[PDB]
Design a binder for this molecule. Structure first.
Ligand SMILES: *[C@@H]1O[C@H](CO)[C@@H](O[C@@H]2O[C@H](CO)[C@@H](O[C@@H]3O[C@H](CO)[C@@H](O)[C@H](O)[C@@H]3O)[C@H](O)[C@H]2NC(C)=O)[C@H](O)[C@H]1NC(C)=O
Ligand SMILES: *[C@@H]1O[C@H](CO)[C@@H](O[C@@H]2O[C@H](CO)[C@@H](O)[C@H](O)[C@H]2NC(C)=O)[C@H](O)[C@H]1NC(C)=O
Ligand SMILES: *[C@@H]1O[C@H](CO)[C@@H](O)[C@H](O)[C@H]1NC(C)=O
Ligand SMILES: *[C@@H]1O[C@H](CO)[C@@H](O)[C@H](O)[C@H]1NC(C)=O
Ligand SMILES: *[C@@H]1O[C@H](CO)[C@@H](O)[C@H](O)[C@H]1NC(C)=O
Ligand SMILES: *[C@@H]1O[C@H](CO)[C@@H](O)[C@H](O)[C@H]1NC(C)=O
Ligand SMILES: *[C@@H]1O[C@H](CO)[C@@H](O)[C@H](O)[C@H]1NC(C)=O
Ligand SMILES: *[C@@H]1O[C@H](CO)[C@@H](O)[C@H](O)[C@H]1NC(C)=O
Lengths: 1276, 49, 50
């Protein structure tokens, strides 16, 4: 027959080539294979085309561009235009606008203040020949839901960029994030840190099992670690040993920690420290959980704590005698030998010699026995001619937890070797098996493999011989293309053939091979494979260096060898504090897995398969036998499935799809230089390798690490690894100390000077004290006899600072001559710079207690200019040279309102209550996202869908009269709900306010609440709730009625006629009842009065109540907020204080909400307190979306939205600024729509703040000013 | 806003009975059955809780 | 688990509408002694005579 097979990796990755391979054979070489790649809706077409000869394989390396949308279904139709035969056949395929991988490697582990945060970032297309491409943004978010620095709107030219941002000496601390987004919305992170601490002069490490098991009475554990140049250190050791989850309550004075022993020790002078244990006391049993530990040790004369949390997730297991398979034979067939190596180990992880097994196969009803080789390896073999389902089993003991499994309270198990193999569906009666090398793979190498084939009747007619074809695949692409054959026998089923195929690079970290043959008879077979192609790079690369150096040995170098025209990441670190805490996600494996679509494998979610309409539904099948028998649905292996496993696709009419019938439905010398960076730069490799000239740092002996990454178009990327270069000085003075003291308070410093070489020498350290401190010793009059190797005796001291900032400290040692008293001799001839005088850094504060000193003031030019002056001036009991203050300048809607805003975007299921919770709040965030101006008409239109469906499903649960309950239909006789219906009228208001509604709904519901009116009273809930929290309130008609008046006065573009004023009337009534008293929870009811009177505009009355609230202040240290008693007069419950939603973000919003209201404008005091209480809002939000109810979420989002609707207008993006202080020290600023929110962290030199504001232009701004200044001169 | 709520079923007299769910005619509905509103401090409506 | 182990002693198993019924209600705990004057809560129910 005419035969063609057309192999295509089944996602279409853009901005790089697309190499799908293709075959022809046996008929019509005058043919034009062509993959037409069309988005028929409208009309795209990225035609692919090629011509070739019969019985050869070739590959068209076309490509794809950016697209209509991101990720899209693609019906790629292949066309093969022969001279006498036509053909046409479609499919479905996928294309995603390439969404790259980018990242950051921050400088170091753990940072001090005062430093330039420098970093980089990368991106590549699928062919990792990297890709210079435009960049939307390059910034950092400050921990508090805010930003501190930025780069923006550049593009890579070297495929890279490096940065810098000198941090202050008194900035914030904690966690930090250089966050970055890719233009199509995709954004992600690389967090990091800056804290304060004191440095290490070493690191050490545990010895311990990561795996202790059941049958254990002790634990091989010890303490072995490094030092300066990996040397020996003297000191003292200690473990933190502990089990988890004993019977204590972890509460009420109790701890979840289970057993915990105690083992300290001395530090030996050679090697490492060893302390082992017992493990009976621990009760390694049913419900005493895994072991979690640390171990920490001192270095003498320096007093160090060394915490490390590791070797922690250990396997105190249940299964012992844990064997496994290694060499599976994935499939079983009736005409083949399959026989897989099977090792066996367990537990600790080394095999026994010569331990027995038990062998079993079923239906093949096999039975046998074996024992272990050196590693248990056995290559058992079976004969096959049996029913369609294999199910194997092998043991050395029996099927049960034999001791005591019928007691439920044990700690044990044992394995069961389990493996399933399915069979080819081969009407050909031919197939292939392999002998793969299914274990560790060498690259830059190659290894030969055999495999085992067969031929049903050989060439039935066919022709003489065949070639067998294979694709070496990569990343759901194609790295290579190959084939091989040889002369056959005439009609025979041979099996011998070998293959070795290249392992250089250019391929994914799988060798997901399949080698397949095919015939002229509408027939095809091939055998998939899979391997761990361990890490291999298109350009391997390393760093190195001529051997390491000593303390003043400033001379240094590099040796990196990569692609010959190529740019790179080249770091180098004083790895003291990066051997303290690690880096994270940094290796060639990082470069790999950071790839999205690591193993592009199998059809994803959206697509199922091709559907072929083979329906073999005979009425009776004529399955000829002693009793007839109908059709069925199998479960066996297929070749369709081989390629679906592989991932790629083709377009052919061979024998692949089984005749699986269609469902019937049934039938009827040392100079200290700055550490904190040794390298981070770019030297570029020429055609003989690069050579950076590093330069070593003196006056500190510590550890070193190479941060690395590389790039170029020519050779593909690469990964080097760690240079480490630990310094050393045969005579060094080492000054150690705490880090956290102040000029106010004294402290001490213990400077040791060591010896490690065979001469023992008299030596006395000294200092050259300063005015910045005041240093005089404790035992200098002592005559230090001498120090031998690791000889270190250390006199005491005491000292305080006086100077402020990045001050330094000095000691000095020097070996001494001609005092032969202690040792056998004292020549004392180290190098010409024998004397070590090491100056080391430190950062001090001014004495005592800096405190909180802040204010909220704010203004907004509306067609004009607003300005202010104000005092940051209160020096009572001030001390010299300590105060330091600041404002910071930006707007207040983009700070931390990305996550929640785009998150809470939802779709309907449930009864009227949660039906509304899933419908309504989407409207407030719709407005909130639109008001910010960072929206999209797609979320909009799919939100039209949201709104229609959710609206309609609200009507699923409403009343036949107009009203609304939770249930509605099928419950005819009923009455709706009051607070519910208030919410529904409110949100009907706003939802019409965005899109079309019908007027009758608001009509009939507004008048429902209107008739909810007998003579006088303030009505209550018609209690039919299913949930007391959906209404955050506390059930009093007070705040209910106040909900009515606000929700019925906010009146967007409709009318609110009768119902709402008498709500104001009862509101005044309850106000009389309350304010005539003094307690209504003191925040909640009267704040609702505030916002009720506000959207009413009872100006004196709203003012009185919100002003009482202003007296009843619960404000925040950086903001404002209000709280119900929090120790409530009635007794409270246990879990979240039930029966009481606590309604803070709803009430505090309803506190926030009174101020913004005035139909022209309120005061700017309202805007100040608003951004205060909204700092509190956004801080009171959590990572999911919304807040702890639906009420608080709705009303928060709306408060925020209309705060904006006040402060936001499209063309109003022109807010200009100045300060005006008389000390020639002021500042001009500007704020707009596109420089719309950069924080301007800015400080001031004057003790007082007499800095007169000015603000002109369009749009409002949020500033926040405060001071830190120390106190406490004497306080006798 | 009136309510006859104590924490249990609460009928006195001669029977254990949660507040005996009735369906009959009182005078607030006899204000409804003509068509007018009015205002009244007095006790015209039944004690449903 | 149960601690703060008070006791009814001279309880009444009836109550009526022309009567005081007064539960001389013990309290002890644990080793078998009560605190000197640990304040408590006597809740009425449908009297809310707490
Ligand atoms: C929410 O989305 C709307 C999308 O339309 C944003 O734009 C608003 O659209 C209206 C359309 O009428 C603008 O009205 C304008 O009025 C002027 C003067 O009559 C006229 O010359 C324009 O052609 C236009 O009709 C409106 O100014 C504009 N902004 C609003 C409504 O404030 C809107 O910005 C987004 N914000 C909201 C409403 O949440
Ligand atoms: C202690 O010595 C160190 C190292 O010399 C000082 O650090 C730098 O010193 C140079 C001297 O010109 C200054 O220009 C730099 O600004 C210093 N580093 C910084 C802060 O970037 C350190 O300042 C000295 N401390 C004091 C004040 O005694
Ligand atoms: C291939 O081309 C030849 C010559 O036109 C023709 O005889 C043959 O039938 C073609 N392949 C088909 C139709 O199987
Ligand atoms: C447009 O649509 C037709 C539909 O048959 C398709 O064949 C063609 O490739 C598409 N693109 C072009 C080239 O117009
Ligand atoms: C480890 O523990 C075993 C006992 O299980 C003990 O005999 C041995 O001396 C210890 N040391 C090592 C590393 O074998
Ligand atoms: C294991 O099974 C084999 C049968 O294949 C039997 O000959 C042998 O005796 C059994 N095990 C022993 C006891 O060696
Ligand atoms: C396995 O045993 C079966 C028993 O019928 C036999 O037909 C087949 O040839 C054997 N295969 C071998 C010898 O590997
Ligand atoms: C009951 O009143 C007393 C004072 O008579 C008071 O000490 C106590 O706290 C109140 N309730 C309790 C037991 O908490």
């Amino acid at each position: 027959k005419p035969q063609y097979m057309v192999l295509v990796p089944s996602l279409l990755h853009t901005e790089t080539t697309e190499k799908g391979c293709v075959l022809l054979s046996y008929l019509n070489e005058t043919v034009t294979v062509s993959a037409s790649l069309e988005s028929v809706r409208g009309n795209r077409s990225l035609f692919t085309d090629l011509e070739a000869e019969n019985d050869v394989l070739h590959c068209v390396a076309f490509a794809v561009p950016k697209s209509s949308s991101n990720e899209e279904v693609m019906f790629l139709t292949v066309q093969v235009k022969g001279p006498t035969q036509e053909f046409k056949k479609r499919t479905t395929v996928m294309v995603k606008n390439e969404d790259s991988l980018v990242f950051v490697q921050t400088d170091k582990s753990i940072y001090k203040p005062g430093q330039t945060v420098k970093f980089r970032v990368v991106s590549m297309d699928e062919n990792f020949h990297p890709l210079n491409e435009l960049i939307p943004l390059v910034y950092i978010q400050d921990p508090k839901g805010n930003r501190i620095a930025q780069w923006q709107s550049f593009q890579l030219e070297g495929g890279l960029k490096q940065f810098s941002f000198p941090l202050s000496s008194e900035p914030f601390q904690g966690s930090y994030k250089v966050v970055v987004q890719k233009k199509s919305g995709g954004r992600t992170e690389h967090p990091f840190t800056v804290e304060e601490f004191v440095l290490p002069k070493f690191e050490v490490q545990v010895t311990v099992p990561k795996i202790i098991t059941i049958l254990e009475e002790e634990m091989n554990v010890s303490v072995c670690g490094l030092y300066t140049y990996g040397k020996p250190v003297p000191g003292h050791v200690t473990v933190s040993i502990c089990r988890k989850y004993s019977d204590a309550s972890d509460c009420h004075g109790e701890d979840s920690q289970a057993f915990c022993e105690k083992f300290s020790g001395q530090l030996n002078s050679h090697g490492c420290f060893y302390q082992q244990v017992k493990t009976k006391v621990f009760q390694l049993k049913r419900k005493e959980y895994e072991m979690k530990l640390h171990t920490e040790a001192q270095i003498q004369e320096e007093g160090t704590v060394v915490e490390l949390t590791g070797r922690q997730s250990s396997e105190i297991t249940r299964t012992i005698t844990k064997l496994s398979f290694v060499k599976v034979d994935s499939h079983f067939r009736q005409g083949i030998p399959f026989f897989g190596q099977v090792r066996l180990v367990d537990g600790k992880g080394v095999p026994i010699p010569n331990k027995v097994i038990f062998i079993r196969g079923n239906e093949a009803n096999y039975y046998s026995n074996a024992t272990t080789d050196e590693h248990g390896l056995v290559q058992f073999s079976i004969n096959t001619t049996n029913v369609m389902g294999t199910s194997l089993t092998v043991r050395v003991n029996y099927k049960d937890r034999s001791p005591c499994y019928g007691y439920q309270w044990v700690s044990e198990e044992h394995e069961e070797a389990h493996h399933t193999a399915y069979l080819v569906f081969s009407p050909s009666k031919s197939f292939v098996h392999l002998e793969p090398m299914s274990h560790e793979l060498p690259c830059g190498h190659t290894q030969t493999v055999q495999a085992h084939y067969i031929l049903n009747g050989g060439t039935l007619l066919g022709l003489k011989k065949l070639s067998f074809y294979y694709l070496i695949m990569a990343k759901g692409g194609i790295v290579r293309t190959g084939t091989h054959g040889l002369l056959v026998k005439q009609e025979d089923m041979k099996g011998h053939f070998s293959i070795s195929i290249p392992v250089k690079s250019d391929i994914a970290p799988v060798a997901r091979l399949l080698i397949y043959a095919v015939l002229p008879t509408g027939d095809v077979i091939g055998d998939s494979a899979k391997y761990d192609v361990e890490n291999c790079l298109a350009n391997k690369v390393d760093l190195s260096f001529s051997p390491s150096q000593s303390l003043p040995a400033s001379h240094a170098h590099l040796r990196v060898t990569a692609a010959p025209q190529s740019v790179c990441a080249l770091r180098a670190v004083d790895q003291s504090v990066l051997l303290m805490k690690p880096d994270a996600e940094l290796s060639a494996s990082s470069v790999y897995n950071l790839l999205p679509e690591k193993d592009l494998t199998g059809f994803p979610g959206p697509l199922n398969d091709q559907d072929n309409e083979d329906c073999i539904n005979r009425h009776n099948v004529y399955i000829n036998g002693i009793t007839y028998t109908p059709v069925s649905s199998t479960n066996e292996k297929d070749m369709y499935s081989f390629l679906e496993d592989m991932g790629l696709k083709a377009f052919t009419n061979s024998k692949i799809r089984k005749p699986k019938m269609c469902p019937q439905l049934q039938q009827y010398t040392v100079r200290k230089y700055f550490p904190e960076t040794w390298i981070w730069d770019l030297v570029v490799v020429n055609s003989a390798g690069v050579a950076e000239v590093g330069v070593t740092v003196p006056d500190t002996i510590t550890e070193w690490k190479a941060g690395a990454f590389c790039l170029s178009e020519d050779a593909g990327l690469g990964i080097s690894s760690t240079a480490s270069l630990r310094a050393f000085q045969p005579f060094f003075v080492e000054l150690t100390m705490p880090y956290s003291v102040i000029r106010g308070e004294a402290f001490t410093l213990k400077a040791t000077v060591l010896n490690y070489l065979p001469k023992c020498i008299r030596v006395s350290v000294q200092l050259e004290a300063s005015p910045a401190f005041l240093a005089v010793p404790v035992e200098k009059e002592q005559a230090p006899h001498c120090i031998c190797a690791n000889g270190r005796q250390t006199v005491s001291w005491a000292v305080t600072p006086k100077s402020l900032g990045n001050v330094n400290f000095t000691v000095s040692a020097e070996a001494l001559e001609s005092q032969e008293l202690c040792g056998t001799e004292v020549p004392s001839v180290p190098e010409h710079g024998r004397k070590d005088t090491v100056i080391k850094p430190l950062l001090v504060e001014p004495e005592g207690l800096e405190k909180e000193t802040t204010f909220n003031s704010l203004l907004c030019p509306s067609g004009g200019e607003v300005s202010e002056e104000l005092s940051l001036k209160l020096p009572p009991n001030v001390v010299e040279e300590s105060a330091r203050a600041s404002v910071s300048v930006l707007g207040d809607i983009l700070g931390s309102a990305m996550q929640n805003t785009q998150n809470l975007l939802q779709m309907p299921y449930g009864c009227g209550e949660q039906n509304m919770v899933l419908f309504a709040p989407n409207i407030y965030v719709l407005d909130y996202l639109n008001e910010t101006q960072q929206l999209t008409p797609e979320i909009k239109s799919k939100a039209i869908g949201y709104l229609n469906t959710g609206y309609q499903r609200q009507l699923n649960y409403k009343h036949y009269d107009g009203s609304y309950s939770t249930f509605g239909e099928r419950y005819g006789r009923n009455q709706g709900n009051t607070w519910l219906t208030a919410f529904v009228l409110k949100t009907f208001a706003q939802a019409r306010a965005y899109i079309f509604i019908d007027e009758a709904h608001i009509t009939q519901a507004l008048i429902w609440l209107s008739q909810r009116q007998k003579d006088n009273g303030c009505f209550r809930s018609s209690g039919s709730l299913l949930n007391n929290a959906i209404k955050g309130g506390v059930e009093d008609e007070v705040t209910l009625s106040a909900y009515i008046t606000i929700a019925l006065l906010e009146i967007p573009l409709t009318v609110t006629h009768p119902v709402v004023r008498n709500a104001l009337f009862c509101l005044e009534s309850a106000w009389k009842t309350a304010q005539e008293g003094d307690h209504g929870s003191h925040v909640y009811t009267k704040a609702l009065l505030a916002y009720a009177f506000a959207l009413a505009g009872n100006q004196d009355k709203r003012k009185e109540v919100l002003k009482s609230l202003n007296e009843e202040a619960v404000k925040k240290d950086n903001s404002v907020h209000w709280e119900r008693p929090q120790k409530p007069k009635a007794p409270v419950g246990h879990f979240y204080e039930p029966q009481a939603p606590s309604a803070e973000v709803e009430m505090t919003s309803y506190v926030l909400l009174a101020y913004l209201t005035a139909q022209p404008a309120p005061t700017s005091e309202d805007l100040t307190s608003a951004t205060n209480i909204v700092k509190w809002i956004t801080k009171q939000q959590n990572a999911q979306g919304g807040f702890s109810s639906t009420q608080d979420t709705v009303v928060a989002l709306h408060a925020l939205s209309k705060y904006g609707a006040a402060t936001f207008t499209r063309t109003g993006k022109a807010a200009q600024v100045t300060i005006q202080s008389s000390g020639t020290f002021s500042s001009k600023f500007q704020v707009d729509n596109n420089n719309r929110l950069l924080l301007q962290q800015v400080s001031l030199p004057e003790l007082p703040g007499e800095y007169s504001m000015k603000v002109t232009g369009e749009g409002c701004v949020y500033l926040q000013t405060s001071l830190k200044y120390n106190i406490l001169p004497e306080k006798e």
